[PDB]
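Complex record, two chains
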Amino acid sequence: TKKSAAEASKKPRQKRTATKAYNVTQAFGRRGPEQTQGNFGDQELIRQGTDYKHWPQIAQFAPSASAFFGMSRIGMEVTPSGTWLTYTGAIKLDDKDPNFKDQVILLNKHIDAYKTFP
Amino acid sequence: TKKSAAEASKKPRQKRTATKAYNVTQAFGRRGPEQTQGNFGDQELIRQGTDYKHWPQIAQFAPSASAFFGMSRIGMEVTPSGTWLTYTGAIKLDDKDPNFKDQVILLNKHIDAYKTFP
């Protein structure tokens, strides 16, 4: 029953789950500055994906499918590469959560982390 | 065991699941043009949420938590309303899926649908 990395890659990109065996770079591409690239994750999170120590503390901010379509600004664009469903939005952190300060520190660690990789 | 609408509202906004009993407007606010508002869903999808006939065909495009953090451009902004985790990205439709044409029609039905509500 244990899935191979190849089996994990069969999922459409938006449904993939990164792990140590099939990591963020492998599932989602290198981190970088371009619009088409993801910018989130330090070297530890990139190499570990959902096996990362603080994954549950990151995932608490990810939207359910209902919320993704409920909260976001959704669009459609046709380009040479194909037809794309575009999305933007924002998620409010709970500054009454006693973990607020740690959540900010955690998110900041990963945002644009690639800029200081050795 | 059946959850009340009040119980559904206890979830953080990004984790809510809209249904007929706790619908898109109730969970996620009115549709509209502002940056802070969602723009997706016709009257049927708004009133039904995940009970909508074509929900599975919409949800196939929503990201897993790993993909949401892997694919998107993530940021943090502090405003008067609080601290926000910002996100943008795009999801490619599979133009080899025999359902492609129907997926485009479906998404277009819901994008900015509020503009033609009676």
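Note: Helices of chain B lie at 5-10, 24-28, 43-48, 55-59, 65-71, 100-110.
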